Amino acid sequence: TNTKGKRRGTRYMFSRPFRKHGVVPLATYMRIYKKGDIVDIKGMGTVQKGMPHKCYHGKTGRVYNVTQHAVGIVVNKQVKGKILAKRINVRIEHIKHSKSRDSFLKRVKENDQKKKEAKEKGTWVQLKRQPAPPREAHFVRTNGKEPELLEPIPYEFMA
Amino acid sequence: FYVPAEPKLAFVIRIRGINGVSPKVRKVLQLLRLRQIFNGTFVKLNKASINMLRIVEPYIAWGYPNLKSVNELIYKRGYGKINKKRIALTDNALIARSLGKYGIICMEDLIHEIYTVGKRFKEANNFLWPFKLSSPRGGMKKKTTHFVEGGDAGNREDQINRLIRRMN
Amino acid sequence: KASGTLREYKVVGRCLPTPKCHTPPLYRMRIFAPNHVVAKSRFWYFVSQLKKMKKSSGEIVYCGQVFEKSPLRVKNFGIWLRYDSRSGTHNMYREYRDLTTAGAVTQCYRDMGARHRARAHSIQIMKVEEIAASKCRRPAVKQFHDSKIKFPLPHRVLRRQHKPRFTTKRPNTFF
Amino acid sequence: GRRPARCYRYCKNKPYPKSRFCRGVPDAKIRIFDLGRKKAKVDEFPLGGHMVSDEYEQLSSEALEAARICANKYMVKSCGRDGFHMRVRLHPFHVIRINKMLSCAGADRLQTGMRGAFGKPQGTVARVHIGQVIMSIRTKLQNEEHVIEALRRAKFKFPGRQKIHISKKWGFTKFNADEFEDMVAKKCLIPDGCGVKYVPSHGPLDKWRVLHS
RNA sequence: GUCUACGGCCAUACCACCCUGAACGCGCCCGAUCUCGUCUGAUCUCGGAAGCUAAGCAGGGUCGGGCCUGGUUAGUACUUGGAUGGGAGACCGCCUGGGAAUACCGGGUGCUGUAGGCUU
RNA sequence: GUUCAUAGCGACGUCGCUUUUUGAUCCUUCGAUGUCGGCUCUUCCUAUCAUUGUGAAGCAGAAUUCACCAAGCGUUGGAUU
RNA sequence: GAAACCUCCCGUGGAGCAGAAGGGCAAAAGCUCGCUUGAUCUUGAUUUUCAGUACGAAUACAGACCGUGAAAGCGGGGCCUC
RNA sequence: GCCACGCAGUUUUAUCCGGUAAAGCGAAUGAUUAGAGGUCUUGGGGCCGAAACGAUCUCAACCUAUUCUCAAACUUUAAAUGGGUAAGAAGCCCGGCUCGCUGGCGUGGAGCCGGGCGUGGAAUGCGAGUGCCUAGUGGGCCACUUUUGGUAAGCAGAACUGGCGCUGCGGGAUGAACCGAACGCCGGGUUAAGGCGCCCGAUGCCGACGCUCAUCAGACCCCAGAAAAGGUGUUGGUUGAUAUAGACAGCAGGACGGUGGCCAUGGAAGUCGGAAUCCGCUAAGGAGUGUGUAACAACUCACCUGCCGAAUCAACUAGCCC
Ligand SMILES: [Mg+2]
Ligand SMILES: [Mg+2]
Ligand SMILES: [Mg+2]
Ligand SMILES: [Mg+2]
Ligand SMILES: [Mg+2]
Ligand SMILES: [Mg+2]
Ligand SMILES: [Mg+2]
Ligand SMILES: [Mg+2]
Ligand SMILES: [Mg+2]
Ligand SMILES: [Mg+2]
Ligand SMILES: [Mg+2]
Ligand SMILES: [Mg+2]
Ligand SMILES: [Mg+2]
Ligand SMILES: [Mg+2]
Ligand SMILES: [Mg+2]
Ligand SMILES: [Mg+2]
Ligand SMILES: [Mg+2]
Ligand SMILES: [Mg+2]
Ligand SMILES: [Mg+2]
Ligand SMILES: [Mg+2]
Numbered sequence A: 001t002n003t004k005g006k007r008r009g010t011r012y013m014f015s016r017p018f019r020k021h022g023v024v025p026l027a028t029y030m031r032i033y034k035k036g037d038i039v040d041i042k043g044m045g046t047v048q049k050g051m052p053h054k055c056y057h058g059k060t061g062r063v064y065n066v067t068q069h070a071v072g073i074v075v076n077k078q079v080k081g082k083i084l085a086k087r088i089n090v091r092i093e094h095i096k097h098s099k100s101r102d103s104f105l106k107r108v109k110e111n112d113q114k115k116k117e118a119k120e121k122g123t124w125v126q127l128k129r130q131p132a133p134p135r136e137a138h139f140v141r142t143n144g145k146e147p148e149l150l151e152p153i154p155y156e157f158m159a
Numbered sequence B: 001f002y003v004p005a006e007p008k009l010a011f012v013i014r015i016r017g018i019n020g021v022s023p024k025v026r027k028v029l030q031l032l033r034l035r036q037i038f039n040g041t042f043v044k045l046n047k048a049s050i051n052m053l054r055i056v057e058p059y060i061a062w063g064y065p066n067l068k069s070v071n072e073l074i075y076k077r078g079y080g081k082i083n084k085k086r087i088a089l090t091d092n093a094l095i096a097r098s099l100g101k102y103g104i105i106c107m108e109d110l111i112h113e114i115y116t117v118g119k120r121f122k123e124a125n126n127f128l129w130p131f132k133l134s135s136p137r138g139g140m141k142k143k144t145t146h147f148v149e150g151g152d153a154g155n156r157e158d159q160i161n162r163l164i165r166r167m168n
Numbered sequence C: 001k002a003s004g005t006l007r008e009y010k011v012v013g014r015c016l017p018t019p020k021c022h023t024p025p026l027y028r029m030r031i032f033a034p035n036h037v038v039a040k041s042r043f044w045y046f047v048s049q050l051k052k053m054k055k056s057s058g059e060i061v062y063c064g065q066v067f068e069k070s071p072l073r074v075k076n077f078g079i080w081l082r083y084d085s086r087s088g089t090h091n092m093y094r095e096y097r098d099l100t101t102a103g104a105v106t107q108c109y110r111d112m113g114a115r116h117r118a119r120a121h122s123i124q125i126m127k128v129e130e131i132a133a134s135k136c137r138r139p140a141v142k143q144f145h146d147s148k149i150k151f152p153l154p155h156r157v158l159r160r161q162h163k164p165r166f167t168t169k170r171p172n173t174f175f
Numbered sequence D: 001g002r003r004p005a006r007c008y009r010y011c012k013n014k015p016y017p018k019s020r021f022c023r024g025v026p027d028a029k030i031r032i033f034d035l036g037r038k039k040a041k042v043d044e045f046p047l048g049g050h051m052v053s054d055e056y057e058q059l060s061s062e063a064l065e066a067a068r069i070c071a072n073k074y075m076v077k078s079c080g081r082d083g084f085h086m087r088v089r090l091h092p093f094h095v096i097r098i099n100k101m102l103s104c105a106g107a108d109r110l111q112t113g114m115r116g117a118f119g120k121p122q123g124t125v126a127r128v129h130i131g132q133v134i135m136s137i138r139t140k141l142q143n144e145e146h147v148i149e150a151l152r153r154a155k156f157k158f159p160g161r162q163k164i165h166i167s168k169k170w171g172f173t174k175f176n177a178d179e180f181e182d183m184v185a186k187k188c189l190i191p192d193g194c195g196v197k198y199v200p201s202h203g204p205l206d207k208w209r210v211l212h213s
Numbered sequence E: 001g002u003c004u005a006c007g008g009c010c011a012u013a014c015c016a017c018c019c020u021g022a023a024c025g026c027g028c029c030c031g032a033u034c035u036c037g038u039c040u041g042a043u044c045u046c047g048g049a050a051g052c053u054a055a056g057c058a059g060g061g062u063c064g065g066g067c068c069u070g071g072u073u074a075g076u077a078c079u080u081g082g083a084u085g086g087g088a089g090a091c092c093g094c095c096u097g098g099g100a101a102u103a104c105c106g107g108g109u110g111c112u113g114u115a116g117g118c119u120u
Numbered sequence F: 001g002u003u004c005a006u007a008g009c010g011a012c013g014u015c016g017c018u019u020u021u022u023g024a025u026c027c028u029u030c031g032a033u034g035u036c037g038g039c040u041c042u043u044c045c046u047a048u049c050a051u052u053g054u055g056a057a058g059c060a061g062a063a064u065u066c067a068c069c070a071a072g073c074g075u076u077g078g079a080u081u
Numbered sequence G: 001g002a003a004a005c006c007u008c009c010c011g012u013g014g015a016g017c018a019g020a021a022g023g024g025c026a027a028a029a030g031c032u033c034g035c036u037u038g039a040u041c042u043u044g045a046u047u048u049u050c051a052g053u054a055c056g057a058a059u060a061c062a063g064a065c066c067g068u069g070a071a072a073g074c075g076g077g078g079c080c081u082c
Numbered sequence H: 001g002c003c004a005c006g007c008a009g010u011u012u013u014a015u016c017c018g019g020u021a022a023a024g025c026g027a028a029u030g031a032u033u034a035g036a037g038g039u040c041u042u043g044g045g046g047c048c049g050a051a052a053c054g055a056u057c058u059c060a061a062c063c064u065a066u067u068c069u070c071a072a073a074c075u076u077u078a079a080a081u082g083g084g085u086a087a088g089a090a091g092c093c094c095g096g097c098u099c100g101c102u103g104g105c106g107u108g109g110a111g112c113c114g115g116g117c118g119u120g121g122a123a124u125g126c127g128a129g130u131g132c133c134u135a136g137u138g139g140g141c142c143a144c145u146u147u148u149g150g151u152a153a154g155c156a157g158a159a160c161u162g163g164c165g166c167u168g169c170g171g172g173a174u175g176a177a178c179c180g181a182a183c184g185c186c187g188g189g190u191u192a193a194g195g196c197g198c199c200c201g202a203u204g205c206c207g208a209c210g211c212u213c214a215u216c217a218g219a220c221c222c223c224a225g226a227a228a229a230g231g232u233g234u235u236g237g238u239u240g241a242u243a244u245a246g247a248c249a250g251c252a253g254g255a256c257g258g259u260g261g262c263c264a265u266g267g268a269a270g271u272c273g274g275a276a277u278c279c280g281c282u283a284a285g286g287a288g289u290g291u292g293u294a295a296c297a298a299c300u301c302a303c304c305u306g307c308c309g310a311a312u313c314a315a316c317u318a319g320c321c322c
């Protein structure tokens, strides 16, 4: 009984944030997108051309094609019990770079720097990041102060 | 006050059966290698493993084993996964042929690596087949509720040793 | 929380140090629990209610059993508590006579269960205090403040009713 | 022609206000929410007594009207017509519907049963939560027992369980009675009508110097 | 320490009123032959340089409004998972983790890129 | 209810019970459970009309009304349909 | 004159954008002018429903021929969802 | 240092996405309660203002600051759970070449060719990838939780997971779905859920502490029957009060004068009603809590006093029982 409209249910999804209507800031147009880099699809509603479908809002894909105003993105979409890599053309207003990829490339560069430096200076260093370890043993000083005694408060109806 | 180091080794025992299990709990139990009730596994404790234990909290009883518990578990019920087969650890050569490249060549080396979580704890622990423990002699309190509310599920700090003594 | 014979635990905890306070304050509570695991759980429950603390955001620096300093002396205990009834929350002050504080609190838990059908998860023990015999308010406790207390055991029911199960003589209740 | 209130006691549906979608709603039974000397100043009636529900349920507009009438009659009888002020703190904003069936000996007469069963607006009820105030009475400090008795009598007109609570606030204000006097003395509060205006220590100094003058 | 041209983020930058402004500048200002538009040289376009910081503009001020950021609200509301927990129900409590928002009370009131000036 | 809330009633509200009404549903029955009423006959229920024993009254008597224990016993002859 | 026109001031849009509603929009996407026919000729790819079939609708390109503007550009119908 | 191609209904670490729960309405849009303060008007008007409402009194509308209560088709703010991506050898870094695309530029982009880097760059687990042919099915139902219609339904319709269907076994006496647990044929040991008077295995413990008497007692998830309202039954608890300056309860007195107070009147004299609550005697007395008298009258109460000599009273609250 649901309609199959392209923008059904996008009332808040494609709406602008509070007090952020009007002219689109130009740094979004000034961003550079190469083939192979990772972008997040958002889909602002001020620009009605090149809009992604509502199923790609919030998804992340890889750029494979660059045109004058849009990019081609390979983004995974789950349909029933299969995931297929859809290719969508999205204008650059509706995308932004992925800071997850940015941080990963930064970490790779920093790890390569550490490898070179540590091979230069001999001593082995850890590069694989570990999960949070159990807390080590330590001493807690009282500083000559008795810890405060806490008791539950009596009940009373307030309002 | 001297706060001891947070324990880095846990023993996890699956206490509930295999009927009517939600998919996430089922997956995490499979990743912990607890596919049967009263199966035990040593788990190296960190943020990821602790969060997995929190996910499967109603289905398991876990705690911090001591040296005696590790010794009893390895010696009485220790089986190796040698060539994908469950082989009883009746000889030191069985351990040496599978773990000697890591320096573990005997029952004592295996027990040391399990107890003091060493560099090759993952290899030493995965070499061990999950322990097939008996039913708890003397019974349980209540398997359907948490330990801190009078039951058996969840994290009992060091009463897992009492549970192990009754369990194997 | 189930029960047994409860024990008193001094539990001291604090928040984990953060780059806002390097030495967070230490907080101490008296927890009456079956064991130290339940004691730590109840400590976290109470400090979460009172301060803005969590088990994950803090740590417990001490948890030790408090032995009774005079278990060979009968004494009067006043217990201030609060509990949730079926239709509200109430504050109660109760009195018991016992040798140990933990035994008095166990008596309180059993008595609340008996008289008000209050389960131990509904009960919050907020103060336990040894009180003088002249400060007692409950007549069932005050009637034992007699230097010349004297009473018999009137109607002694046979408890060995199955050893023997069959006999010729009918039991005597007067002794 | 009204159904028993047991058929609409519980908050089973989503809130269904009288709006541009729900049209044709009959007017609520209760139209007056404030009674007694409403023009009395704040210091005139220092004592406030609330009646507080203990159940999450729906109170009908007719029930609110009946409770208001009962409390008003007892308060007028006891404390006089100018010795109290009552405020009903519940408004019947939730429309309850009825799927009307024909009460005749026939189902062939286009009854249709459960087909197209969405109902027509029957009435309006107020949704009340646990701990929410239903009625409030402010009066002199010596009429506390009369307020308690009036609210106790009004309790019998409602389905669930209600408690009578003598609030610590001064009258209908949100400020504690013990702090009210010295707050008015230091001019943190300015009386107007039945309420007080809180005067914070920020803003233009012209508003500060019109006070203290 | 500032300004101008072009900006990036788009109120910590806005709004109301008041005070101050050296030198460049930006302006207000003067005029309609040409260029160009008008009901109207008001606007736009053009040609200027007598006067003025009155205004714009810049800086500052206001127990200022707003905005931004904190505290409180509050481990409250709400919530993942659990129980052969309670209750006639409505609902509620506990265990295991996560965790808000008003009112109220504080602090702040643009940062900065390129190019070019002024400031002894 | 001449006064008097509650002898007897009970507005506005609100809580229930019953399955002797009519609905709602469609779980059983469509290789079929004979579908209304009357007649006949037995048994059961009590939310008691009468009768037995009681309490109350705006119970003087008489009559009546309200309520309790209570289903032992009875609850009819006819015109029209 | 309460509403005719003229003037100033305030005015974040509380108007308008054909229609239902929602989103979007201010030297806009609204109003008024000027010039026009990109509502034209073509091949593929893609999104939406989806079985990843079709139709319909839509998005980004590419090749012609054009319109407009000083130009950057924009335009192959209607601001988007029928 | 080193121990497989690769994968995952899982976590961790980064990084985005969202508008539900909650919250808000002295924030927009709608709905909505009550006062307060102001000053213009085709508000009513207002008593002596026509005369310049000489005046200014009230009620409107309006504005301002507050105030009560709300929203599935409202929202500034905004969770939990959740959805996507990344966590390297297809990577990183050096050079060099090609281009008809782009272009101030040896520019940008893409491709291609050599070379060097292994600490294999979170945890945990698991061996993966791929093709062909293909049956049956396409009536479902149930439970926790979320949820729409309906008074409700063993009703109708959705979301999530599990189950029954397709499944036996232990327990719930009995039972498609509940709880435990899933199954080759057996011996021994131990448990789960549930139990241990007898049926019927197991408390034939010298079990612990209390609560409860029912002339319809009560007795264990689903579940197989009950509510509002009451109780001077009993047990706890909260708040308040009185008391050797003698409480409480009983027994016995006074309970007045003005004043048989005023306006109600046909009697209402304290009590058929409206207002106000005086004074003094003091031991106290309401110019009255009730009975009643046609009305008087006569009683009672709250108030005090006498006898009595130690504790007592009230209102709530929630357990079992009624
Ligand atoms: Mg199960
Ligand atoms: Mg045994
Ligand atoms: Mg379960
Ligand atoms: Mg009826
Ligand atoms: Mg509904
Ligand atoms: Mg300010
Ligand atoms: Mg919680
Ligand atoms: Mg009358
Ligand atoms: Mg037949
Ligand atoms: Mg037959
Ligand atoms: Mg009867
Ligand atoms: Mg073209
Ligand atoms: Mg278009
Ligand atoms: Mg939505
Ligand atoms: Mg809400
Ligand atoms: Mg609003
Ligand atoms: Mg159904
Ligand atoms: Mg079948
Ligand atoms: Mg199956
Ligand atoms: Mg089965």
Ligand SMILES: [Mg+2]
Pocket: none
């Ligand atoms: Mg069975």
Ligand SMILES: [Mg+2]
Pocket: H172
């Ligand atoms: Mg049964």
Ligand SMILES: [Mg+2]
Pocket: none
């Ligand atoms: Mg056996």
Ligand SMILES: [Mg+2]
Pocket: none
């Ligand atoms: Mg049995």
Ligand SMILES: [Mg+2]
Pocket: none
């Ligand atoms: Mg037996």
